[PDB]
Design a protein around this ligand. Structure first.
Ligand code: CLA
Ligand code: CLA
Ligand code: CLA
Ligand code: CLA
Ligand code: CLA
Ligand code: CLA
Ligand code: CLA
Ligand SMILES: CCCCCCCCCCCCCCCCCC(=O)OC[C@H](CO[C@@H]1O[C@H](CO)[C@H](O)[C@H](O)[C@H]1O)OC(=O)CCCCCCCCCCCCCCCCC
Ligand SMILES: CC1=C(C#C/C(C)=C/C=C/C(C)=C/C=C/C=C(C)/C=C/C=C(C)/C=C/[C@@]23O[C@]2(C)C[C@@H](O)CC3(C)C)C(C)(C)C[C@H](O)C1
Ligand SMILES: CC1=C(C#C/C(C)=C/C=C/C(C)=C/C=C/C=C(C)/C=C/C=C(C)/C=C/C2=C(C)C[C@@H](O)CC2(C)C)C(C)(C)C[C@H](O)C1
Ligand SMILES: CC1=C(/C=C/C(C)=C/C=C/C(C)=C/C=C/C=C(C)/C=C/C=C(C)/C=C/C2=C(C)CCCC2(C)C)C(C)(C)CCC1
Lengths: 132, 165, 170, 33, 131, 164, 185, 146, 74
């Protein structure tokens, strides 16, 4: 289900084969030309499409472009060398910009930025003021 | 001495049993030793002849080397000869490698690596006897070339015929 | 038909290099093979002879004769006739062994054959191939020499004559 | 003679020493204790 | 699917100045520091791809890929808890002739697929499951 | 059968050209040898032609332009060391070529391995290949003609278009 | 004083080097000893040559033009031929040593103990049973034991020669000649 | 006709199959080079590589060095080459230690500690010997004149 | 840590060349090293000072030595 592309010297390298790799998938209603983050132009297929990239940002950048084409069914995965796959985005099925009941707060401090502790107070502690 | 020596060619009439008084077999691997024994021996066999051949039977028609003394000619000879000599030896060494990899043997094996005269016996009995003769002649030659050199530098060290000098 | 199996094939791919399709059947091939061998053997001796003479060596009683084709033209025919007589006799003597490769004269009166030289079949094939190949080379060689002799007088192209190193012969 | 020391030490201090030191640092920083 | 495969890495968070393993782990379990190319007929990076007659470009031979079928499974596994929360709330709001959470899930996902199910409010779900 | 498959080399002026029928009974291997020889002999000829032309013209800016403008005289003047390098270098390439030939899928004459990207189905490819062959065939005859002129007629320059 | 403790402490303080056999180890004792034994020959040879005037054109300095500033001791002053020749002899030897260190055989005693060398086990074993204060007789002849004993002897001699030379205020070459009976000179 | 295609038919890998990258010539040359050739042992691989690199290195030093015009120029050139070989050998040793570690198992894989050590040794012998060969050759240069 | 910057896990676990660069330039900021107590800090600083003093004296010794052995003071 690979989109039609002729190849580039800006594709993935060894890290994709020995450390980690990424993959995005989407469905289209027409064959159209899009610009790939790696560099160049490609033609998507009329239906399912799969593409591999080396960075999550590269994948999410393409998603932005896809939204312009009115495609909002994209999914991003991380494939480890052993074959293990992790579903990353949309994580809970709902885009992050939309509040979804069932999501808990993380890394939240209940005070204004100016209420953090003084650096000297936490000296020889190992923690930082913003983590204190 | 190493046990394998008991099952190898080399012991004969003048040496009924394994000769390794200092048990060098303990240190040097048995295989490497035989390979080296033959290599140094075969080369020595050729040297002995070369030590006197130019003197006794004459020299080629050239003036690069004027002396006949075996040692002196080494420096008189043009360097180009020496370079080509190293090259030919390298070629020989390569041949032994490639042919050995083809299953052939240059150490008394079943399939000869170099038998241009086609005189390698088929029967194992004769083969064994043939190998023994080569080893002997080789050992004798090594001793001889050493002797020649000795008398050359330290006169009287060895009983060498005058012509051989 | 397929003479690739025959000794002397150019190589595994080309098989028998017969550009003009002289050979058609085994019968013809045998004819051609016999001829090639004969010419080859004759040539091998010829090159040896030409070189020996051109370089200067002469038999007792032949110290004033010239060398090369010039000899054939100048030397007395009477002293050349012996060659024909000694060759014609051989022509009659050599006897081809039936059911054997062309050029096998094992059936000759005097003992002739692989004798002690060859043991295995492979050894025989090798010696045979070498005889043929060396003959092929000489055939070209003797021509090359004669031609150049006529062209410039230098039968060896790069040097006038050979110098031999025969220690024992001295 | 001490006079020969300049010609015996300088070659060592400026060439041998720096080399070995750099090698050791590389081996030290490329090792994962 | 081992949902902790990524978390199970050699990374050890430091005291101060580190966000941590986050949600999906901070580093790949595997070490990128593998060797270079090897002679024909040999392998280097463990489960590497044989370069055949071009060992020099072996690293360009892909061996890591995503199976579309397998892709479905990873989607379901990593979003299992979310689905659970969703159906639970639907159950809490007095479902019409409710049966079993799982049963309801199957019915509700039989229609509206699965992705659509994950993106629907309990209200919409109840409307959908009115029947 | 080579005759039933060959496409390159057959052009318009004469079509298939074998008046003496030197390829009637030859097998594919022999025919392959012939095509390879044809191309090699031709390609070398083309190069030789260019070399002769440049030297004759006087554009031989090497060795302080010491060597003669006559191409055949110059060869004699060239030191042997120069010739040895030439033969040995070409010999090296010949060895590599043999390796390529052994590899499966070898198309007689292809050392760049263009078979990997293009086949004879493409007309553009076959046409361009034909141009190499045709020019090579002509060059072969030309180099033979020029040598005659230089060795017998006595000239090593154009005696055809020189008269404006 | 127990020797063993000191060695252990060194290993602890400098573990990385100790792993390869560097420092106060049997390996070092063997190798350094071998070199000292060999040197004695070199030093005696130098003495003989000096006394018998064998070295060609000694007491003369190499040309600063043929050779370079590398041959200068101070300013334009250059090294004498004798010292140069002695050095070249040593360089011949050092080259052999470098080859042996960088390109060891499969049945050779490597300078450092490498787990990936086939002789590692034998070397480890030999070293494990070669330690003592007194030479172990009964293992005379060509044995590892004899080698170590002779090596220690040679190394001690070097120390003694230097000391005696200083006490008597003489060159080491002179002391050598003296201990031989004045034969060389 | 397109002479440039995606490498290994993977449109997303960062490489392309150009005539330079994948031609019979390039493939043949690289396959038979000592580094990638099939069958060569680690030692032999190093030896061939060393023999090749040592022969061409004596030139630069001998003809352009500080003592080029001296009668002992060639000798000096040889010594300089040996010095460079030693530096390169140190590098090889250090690289192996860091890249491969301390104990190995696979064996006969240029990419292991034991194999690398053997490779390094071969390089040293070949390089130094090759330089010596050049010394002998450059001592007397043939004019190839009849 | 198990890498070059033993005093910093953060730098030690870095997959780039920064690990080496920063480790060298953050070596003498003993106060920020992982697991540093005030007592240890003072003790290490005191010892480091002894080393600096030694370097200063070695430097002075060299000047005297070289002037005496290769100079023209007299
Ligand atoms: C080309 C033909 C040819 C000719 C014209 C001669 C002519 C001669 N040879 Mg002669 N020879 C020839 C070929 C020829 N040889 C060949 C091919 C050989 C090799 C077998 C010899 C071997 C030979 C010997 C061994 C002797 C001669 C001798 C002679 C001389 C007297 C002939 C003889 O034996 O007593 C009639 C005479 C000048 C004899 C001679 O001159 O006495 C010293 C003599 O002893 N020849
Ligand atoms: C026309 C030349 C010629 C002549 C006169 C002889 C004559 C002789 N050969 Mg013979 N031989 C010849 C050509 C000739 N052979 C050739 C060309 C070959 C190679 C095929 C041989 C191979 C050959 C062998 C193998 C043997 C002889 C043997 C003999 C002797 C019995 C006899 C003297 C026999 C002999 O007595 O050997 C000592 C013997 O065993 N020859
Ligand atoms: C204190 C340090 C130091 C010393 C002692 C030298 C010494 C020398 N340099 Mg130098 N150099 C240095 C630092 C140093 N350099 C630095 C830092 C640079 C970088 C800018 C250079 C760049 C440089 C260049 C570009 C050149 C030199 C050259 C030379 C040589 C010229 C004299 C001569 O006779 O040449 C003639 C050479 C000889 C007689 C050969 C001498 C034998 C060699 C040196 C043996 C080396 C083996 C050595 C042990 C291997 C090292 C192993 C490793 C573990 C350290 C001389 C040996 C020239 C030369 O010829 O290099 C050899 C030259 O072209 N140098
Ligand atoms: C190296 C020489 C050489 C070789 C090997 C070939 C080989 C081939 N040519 Mg060819 N050709 C050549 C030169 C050569 N050509 C030249 C110079 C011309 C220009 C006139 C042509 C023009 C030509 C045409 C127009 C056609 C061919 C074709 C062919 C192929 C089929 C015909 C055949 O089997 O010929 C067999 C030929 C040989 C086995 C070798 C040639 C015979 C040698 C050269 C004998 C020398 C004769 C000659 C008169 C020598 C004197 C030259 C000069 C002194 C006057 C075959 C692969 C046909 C083709 O491509 O079909 C696929 C085709 O249509 N050729
Ligand atoms: C490996 C690199 C290399 C190097 C260093 C040289 C070096 C040289 N080549 Mg050479 N050459 C090379 C590769 C190389 N070539 C290759 C790959 C080819 C093609 C096969 C040639 C073909 C070639 C020719 C045809 C000639 C040279 C000539 C020369 C010499 C220039 C003139 C001279 O002797 O002045 C000092 C010089 C020694 C010329 C020569 O020696 O004539 C005097 C000459 O005529 N070369
Ligand atoms: C493809 C056709 C062709 C070819 C192969 C040649 C080849 C040649 N011409 Mg030529 N020429 C041509 C067409 C051609 N000419 C045409 C169409 C004209 C008319 C403008 C000329 C006019 C011409 C002159 C006036 C001269 C040449 C000369 C030459 C020779 C020197 C090479 C050079 O640099 O030329 C340039 C060379 C053999 C030169 C020559 O013969 O040198 C001795 C020369 O003086 N040519
Ligand atoms: C970068 C420019 C440059 C160049 C070309 C030179 C050139 C030279 N310097 Mg110099 N030098 C330079 C910068 C340069 N210098 C700088 C910046 C300094 C200040 C530090 C010096 C300081 C210096 C000193 C102190 C000395 C020299 C010396 C020398 C000479 C000795 C050459 C030598 O041993 O190299 C050895 C070279 C090599 C071992 C390798 C050369 C590179 C190879 C040939 C590249 C091959 C690439 C290949 C073609 C790729 C394709 C391969 C494929 C076909 C298979 C030479 C004339 C010495 C001398 O006598 O002066 C005349 C000397 O004593 N230099
Ligand atoms: C060589 C054996 C005999 C040498 C001899 O007799 O000396 C006698 C000669 C003495 O040649 C000297 O040359 C100088 C410079 O020209 C001087 O000017 C004199 O000519 C001369 O006295 O030695 C040589 O020069 C030839 C030896 C060349 C060695 C070949 C290289 C072998 C590899 C060397 C690298 C070793 C490092 C590891 C090896 C793996
Ligand atoms: C203080 C202390 C202790 C101690 C101690 C003691 C006594 C320590 C003393 C150690 C001592 C004194 C060790 C001598 C070494 C001499 C060597 C290595 C000579 C090498 C010589 C070599 C390598 C020879 C080289 C040459 O051949 C070459 C290279 C070139 C030739 O031209 C010339 C020569 C021949 C020169 C205790 C009590 C034991 C334990 C306690 O806990 C700590
Ligand atoms: C001593 C010395 C010097 C020297 C020197 C010396 C000896 C130098 C030696 C140089 C030498 C041997 C160079 C050798 C060159 C050989 C070549 C190209 C061979 C090509 C083979 C090919 C294509 C094979 C093709 C095939 C055919 C068709 C049939 C098929 O079936 C199979 C197959 C077999 C594959 C110098 C020159 C370095 C100068 C210095 O100063 C002094
Ligand atoms: C441009 C080009 C090319 C290339 C060229 C080149 C790059 C060359 C190089 C070359 C080289 C670079 C060569 C080398 C050589 C080397 C040698 C030849 C060596 C030898 C050695 C020896 C022989 C031995 C030694 C030794 C040893 C081993 C040790 C002991 C001692 C002795 C001495 C024995 C060609 C033409 C292909 C084609 C076109 C392109």
């Amino acid at each position: 289900p690979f989109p039609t592309f002729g190849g580039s010297t800006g594709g993935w390298l060894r890290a994709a084969e020995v450390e980690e790799k990424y993959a995005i998938t989407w469905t289209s209603t027409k064959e159209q030309i899009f610009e790939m983050p790696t560099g160049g132009a490609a033609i998507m297929r009329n239906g399912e499409n799969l593409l591999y990239l080396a960075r999550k940002e590269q994948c999410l950048a393409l998603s932005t472009q896809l939204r312009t084409f009115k495609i909002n069914d994209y999914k991003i995965y991380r494939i480890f060398p052993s074959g293990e796959v992790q579903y990353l985005h949309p994580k809970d099925g709902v885009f992050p910009e939309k509040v979804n009941p069932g999501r808990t707060s993380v890394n939240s401090r209940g005070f204004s930025i100016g209420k953090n502790p003084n650096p000297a107070s936490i000296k020889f502690s190992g923690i930082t003021t913003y983590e204190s | 001495y190493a046990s394998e020596l008991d099952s190898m060619t080399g012991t004969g009439i003048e040496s009924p049993k394994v000769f390794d008084p200092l048990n060098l077999s303990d240190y040097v691997p048995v295989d490497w030793a035989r390979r080296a024994e033959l290599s140094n021996g075969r080369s020595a066999m050729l040297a002995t002849v070369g030590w006197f051949f130019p003197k006794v039977f004459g020299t080629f028609d050239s003036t690069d080397v004027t002396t006949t003394d075996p040692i002196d000619a080494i420096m008189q000879a043009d360097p180009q000869w020496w370079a080509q000599w190293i090259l030919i030896c390298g070629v020989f060494e390569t041949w032994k490698y490639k042919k050995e990899m083809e299953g052939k043997s240059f150490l008394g094996g079943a399939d000869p690596a170099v038998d241009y005269l086609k005189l390698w016996p088929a029967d194992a009995a004769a083969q064994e006897e043939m190998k023994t003769k080569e080893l002997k002649n080789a050992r004798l030659a090594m001793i001889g070339i050493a002797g020649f050199a000795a008398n050359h530098f330290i006169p009287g060290s060895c009983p060498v015929p005058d012509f051989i000098a | 038909a397929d003479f690739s199996g025959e000794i002397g094939a150019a190589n595994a791919e080309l098989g028998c290099w017969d550009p003009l399709n002289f050979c058609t059947d085994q019968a013809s091939f045998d004819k051609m093979r016999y001829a090639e061998l004969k010419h080859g053997r004759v040539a091998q001796l010829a090159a040896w002879g030409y070189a020996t003479t051109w370089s200067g060596a002469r038999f007792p009683g032949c110290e004033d004769f010239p060398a090369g084709h010039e000899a054939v033209l100048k030397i007395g025919t009477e002293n050349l006739i012996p060659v024909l007589v000694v060759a014609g006799a051989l022509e009659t003597l050599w006897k081809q062994k039936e059911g054997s490769f062309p050029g096998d004269f094992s059936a000759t009166s005097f003992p002739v054959g692989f004798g002690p030289f060859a043991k295995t079949e492979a050894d025989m094939i090798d010696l045979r191939t070498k005889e043929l190949n060396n003959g092929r080379a000489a055939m070209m060689g003797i021509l090359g020499m004669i031609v150049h002799e006529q062209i410039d007088g230098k039968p060896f192209i790069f040097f006038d004559k050979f110098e031999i190193y025969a220690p024992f012969g001295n | 003679a001490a006079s020969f020391l300049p010609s015996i030490l300088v070659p060592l201090v400026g060439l041998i020493f720096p080399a070995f030191s750099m090698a050791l640092f590389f081996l030290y920083v490329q090792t994962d204790d | 699917v081992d949902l902790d495969y990524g978390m199970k890495n050699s990374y050890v968070p430091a005291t101060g100045g580190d966000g941590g393993q986050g949600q999906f782990g901070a580093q790949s379990p595997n070490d990128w520091r593998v060797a270079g190319t090897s002679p024909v007929g040999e392998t280097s990076y463990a489960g590497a791809a044989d370069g055949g007659e071009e060992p020099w470009f072996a690293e360009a031979i892909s061996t890591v890929s995503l199976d579309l079928q397998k892709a479905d499974e990873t989607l379901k596994a990593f979003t299992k808890d979310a689905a659970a929360f969703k159906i639970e709330e639907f159950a809490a709001e007095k479902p019409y002739g409710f049966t079993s959470s799982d049963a309801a899930m199957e019915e509700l996902v039989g229609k509206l697929g699965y992705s659509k199910f994950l993106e629907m409010s309990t209200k919409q779900l109840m409307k959908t499951w009115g029947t | 059968a080579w005759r039933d498959e060959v496409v390159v080399g057959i052009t318009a002026p004469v079509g298939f050209f074998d008046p003496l029928g030197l390829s009637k009974g030859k097998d594919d291997a022999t025919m392959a040898y012939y095509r390879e020889a044809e191309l090699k002999n031709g390609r070398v000829a083309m190069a030789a032609c260019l070399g002769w032309y440049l030297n004759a013209g006087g554009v031989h800016p090497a060795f302080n332009s010491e060597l003669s403008n006559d191409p055949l005289k110059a060869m004699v003047e060239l030191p042997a060391v120069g010739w040895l390098q030439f033969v040995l270098g070409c010999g090296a390439i010949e060895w590599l070529g043999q390796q390529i030939k052994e590899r499966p899928g070898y198309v007689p004459g292809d050392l760049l391995g263009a078979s990997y990207w293009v086949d004879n189905s493409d007309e553009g490819w076959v046409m361009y290949q034909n141009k190499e062959l045709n020019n090579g065939r002509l060059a072969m005859l030309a180099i033979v003609g020029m040598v005659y002129q230089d060795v017998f007629v006595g000239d090593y320059g154009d005696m055809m278009y020189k008269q404006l | 004083s127990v020797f063993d403790d000191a060695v252990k402490d060194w290993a602890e303080e400098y573990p990385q080097f100790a792993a390869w056999g560097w420092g106060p180890s049997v390996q070092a004792e063997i190798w350094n000893g071998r070199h000292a034994m060999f040197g004695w020959v070199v030093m005696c040879a130098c003495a003989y040559a000096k006394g018998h005037g064998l070295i060609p054109d000694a007491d003369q300095t190499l040309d600063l033009k043929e050779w370079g500033t590398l041959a200068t001791i101070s300013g334009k002053n250059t090294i004498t031929n004798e010292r140069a020749i002695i050095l070249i002899a040593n360089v011949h030897a050092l080259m052999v040593g470098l080859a042996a260190t960088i390109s060891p055989n499969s049945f050779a005693d490597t300078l450092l103990l490498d787990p990936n060398h086939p002789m590692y086990e034998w070397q480890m074993e030999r070293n494990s049973k070669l330690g003592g204060v007194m030479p172990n007789l009964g293992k005379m002849g060509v044995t590892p034991e004899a080698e170590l004993a002779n090596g220690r002897m040679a190394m001690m001699g070097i120390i003694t020669c230097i000391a005696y030379s200083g006490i008597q205020g003489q060159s080491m070459i002179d002391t050598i000649n003296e201990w031989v009976g004045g034969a060389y000179f | 006709a397109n002479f440039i295609k995606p490498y290994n038919d993977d449109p997303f890998v960062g490489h392309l199959a150009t005539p330079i990258t994948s031609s019979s010539l390039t493939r043949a040359l690289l396959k038979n080079l000592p580094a990638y050739r099939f069958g060569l042992t680690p030692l032999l691989r190093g030896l061939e590589i060393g023999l090749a690199h040592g022969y061409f290195l004596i030139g630069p030093f001998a003809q352009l060095g500080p003592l080029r015009n001296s009668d002992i120029g060639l000798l000096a050139g040889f010594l300089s080459t040996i010095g460079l070989i030693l530096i390169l050998t140190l590098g090889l040793t250090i690289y192996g230690a860091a890249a491969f570690g301390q104990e190995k198992s696979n064996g006969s894989e240029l990419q292991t500690k034991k194999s690398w050590d053997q490779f390094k040794g071969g390089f040293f012998v070949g390089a130094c010997g090759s330089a010596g060969f050049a010394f002998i050759c450059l001592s007397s240069i043939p004019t190839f004149a009849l | 840590a198990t890498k070059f910057p033993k005093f910093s896990q953060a730098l030690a676990q870095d997959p780039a060349t920064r690990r080496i660069w920063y480790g060298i330039a953050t070596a003498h900021d003993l106060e920020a090293h992982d697991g540093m107590t005030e007592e240890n800090l003072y003790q290490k600083i005191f010892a480091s000072h002894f080393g600096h003093l030694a370097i200063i004296f070695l430097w002075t010794s060299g000047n005297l030595f070289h002037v005496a052995w290769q100079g023209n003071f007299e």
